[PDB]
Amino acid sequence: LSSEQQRAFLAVTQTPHPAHLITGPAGTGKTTLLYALQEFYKGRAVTLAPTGTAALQARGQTVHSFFRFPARLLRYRHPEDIRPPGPHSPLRKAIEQMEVLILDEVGMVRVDLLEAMDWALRKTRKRLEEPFGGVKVLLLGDTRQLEPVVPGGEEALYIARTWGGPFFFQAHVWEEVALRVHRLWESQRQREDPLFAELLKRLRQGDPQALETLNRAAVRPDGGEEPGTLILTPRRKEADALNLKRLEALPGKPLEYQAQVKGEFAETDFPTEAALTLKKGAQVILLRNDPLGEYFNGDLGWVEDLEAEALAVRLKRNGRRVVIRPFVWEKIVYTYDSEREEIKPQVVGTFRQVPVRLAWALTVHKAQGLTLDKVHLELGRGLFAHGQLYVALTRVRRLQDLSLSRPIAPTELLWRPEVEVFETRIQEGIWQKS
DNA sequence: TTTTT
Ligand SMILES: Nc1ncnc2c1ncn2[C@@H]1O[C@H](COP(=O)(O)OP(=O)(O)O)[C@@H](O)[C@H]1O
Ligand SMILES: [Mg+2]
Numbered sequence: 371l372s373s374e375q376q377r378a379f380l381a382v383t384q385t386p387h388p389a390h391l392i393t394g395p396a397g398t399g400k401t402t403l404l405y406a407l408q409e410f411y412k413g414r415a416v417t418l419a420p421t422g423t424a425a426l427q428a429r430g431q432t433v434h435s436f437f438r439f440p441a442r443l444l445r446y447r448h449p450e451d452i453r454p455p456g457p458h459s460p461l462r463k464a465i466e467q468m469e470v471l472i473l474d475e476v477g478m479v480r481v482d483l484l485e486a487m488d489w490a491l492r493k494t495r496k497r498l499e500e501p502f503g504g505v506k507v508l509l510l511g512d513t514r515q516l517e518p519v520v521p522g523g524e525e526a527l528y529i530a531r532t533w534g535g536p537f538f539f540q541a542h543v544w545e546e547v548a549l550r551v552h553r554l555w556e557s558q559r560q561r562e563d564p565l566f567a568e569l570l571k572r573l574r575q576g577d578p579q580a581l582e583t584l585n586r587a588a589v590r591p592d593g594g595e596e597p598g599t600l601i602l603t604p605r606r607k608e609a610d611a612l613n614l615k616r617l618e619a620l621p622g623k624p625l626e627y628q629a630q631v632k633g634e635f636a637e638t639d640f641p642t643e644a645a646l647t648l649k650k651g652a653q654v655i656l657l658r659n660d661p662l663g664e665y666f667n668g669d670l671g672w673v674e675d676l677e678a679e680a681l682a683v684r685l686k687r688n689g690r691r692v693v694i695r696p697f698v699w700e701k702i703v704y705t706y707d708s709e710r711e712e713i714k715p716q717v718v719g720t721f722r723q724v725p726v727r728l729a730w731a732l733t734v735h736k737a738q739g740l741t742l743d744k745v746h747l748e749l750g751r752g753l754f755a756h757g758q759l760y761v762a763l764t765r766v767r768r769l770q771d772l773s774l775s776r777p778i779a780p781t782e783l784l785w786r787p788e789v790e791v792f793e794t795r796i797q798e799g800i801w802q803k804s
Numbered sequence: 805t806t807t808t809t
Contacts, residue, residue: 440809520806667808
């Protein structure tokens with residue numbers, strides 16, 4: 371509906387050039403424009419996103435769940451990690467007929483995921499000569515929002531010598547196709563609070579005086595119990611503690627879903643709580659996709675019935691009831707063996723638990739992309755990722771709806787240099803690799 | 805530290 375939305379819709383549908391990017395600050399309407407691209411490209415297009423919450427918000431699915439990529443480092447063009455589907459599988463028949471791939475929240479898309487989408491699309495359509503196999507890809511997202519996640523294994527050494535960085539614009543595909551950049555400026559999520567919107571405009575460039583304005587405006591440590599509030603917190607275990615304190619305020623019998631952890635599985639890598647106490651009405655979020663498709667990762671809901679090795683959840687999207695059973699997680703580490711310059715994956719331990727965690731309080735990574743009614747930001751040991759603070763402050767429409775526990779220190783205004791070179795070289799309208 | 809199955 372917006373002008374820059376309508377002009378970005380046209381610049382993307384009216385030209386047959388693949389590799390477009392529609393970027394802009396948070397709440398400018400990228401994902402809403404995607405809903406319009408979906409109506410334009412009905413049935414011709416698949417909508418993907420890197421995260422489960424962002425995928426549901428965009429009315430699509432995660433990139434891994436579509437291509438069936440393993441949840442590990444997708445080595446460059448490596449047939450052990452990236453594998454094309456079967457000769458007459460229904461996945462194959464979807465890649466072949468499709469012509470548009472809409473990829474939302476492109477900023478959280480790690481370079482190895484994008485480079486795997488390229489190769490996977492080349493091999494299945496057997497156009498190994500053409501980027502993305504001839505699919506017209508439409509990227510949407512923001513690079514000043516959260517960076518892609520890199521675990522401290524040899525994966526970070528593999529990424530740093532094959533791409534030199536984890537961001538999607540460091541993928542080697544951009545040396546074969548130029549990326550066309552369309553920009554949105556005027557904010558729509560915060561169209562009601564213009565000064566909140568422009569406070570957030572100067573915060574995304576890191577204006578320090580625009581931050582002391584924030585610390586005296588929106589600090590209400592008591593902000594965590596006004597009903598209708600969603601608590602954002604950086605670290606997962608911090609969210610566990612806040613979740614349980616709200617959980618003890620419900621008049622139901624609790625169930626303790628003890629996890630069967632095994633092998634060398636660290637506690638810091640725990641997807642959900644190990645003990646995971648849950649009551650008959652708790653607000654949960656689902657962490658794994660249903661092999662039958664009635665629920666997905668990132669699905670918010672509330673418990674209705676819970677039992678020994680299963681429980682039922684009312685999903686908030688469709689208002690329907692699902693029953694979840696314990697999925698099994700597994701930890702992958704990358705070992706340098708043999709004394710050859712090739713690393714190889716290994717599984718060192720499993721974590722069998724019900725794919726559920728409480729969601730009175732959520733991480734910030736699972737909040738990116740969402741429009742929330744009311745948010746309280748509880749800073750634990752602090753901010754550790756790039757764009758993590760900007761994401762937590764932009765989920766609301768009015769400042770009135772945002773709450774801080776402590777005043778932010780400029781200490782927490784992280785920033786990557788790879789992003790500034792990108793944001794500077796796309797001022798021309800194009801990105802082809804340096 | 806955080807995501808993805
Ligand atoms: N043209 C528009 N008119 C009215 N509201 C809009 C418009 N575009 C977006 N919005 C609203 O702004 C909110 C944020 O939009 P969203 O698509 O999330 O932007 P982004 O994906 O860039 O964060 C949504 O709740 C939506 O209703
Ligand atoms: Mg969005």
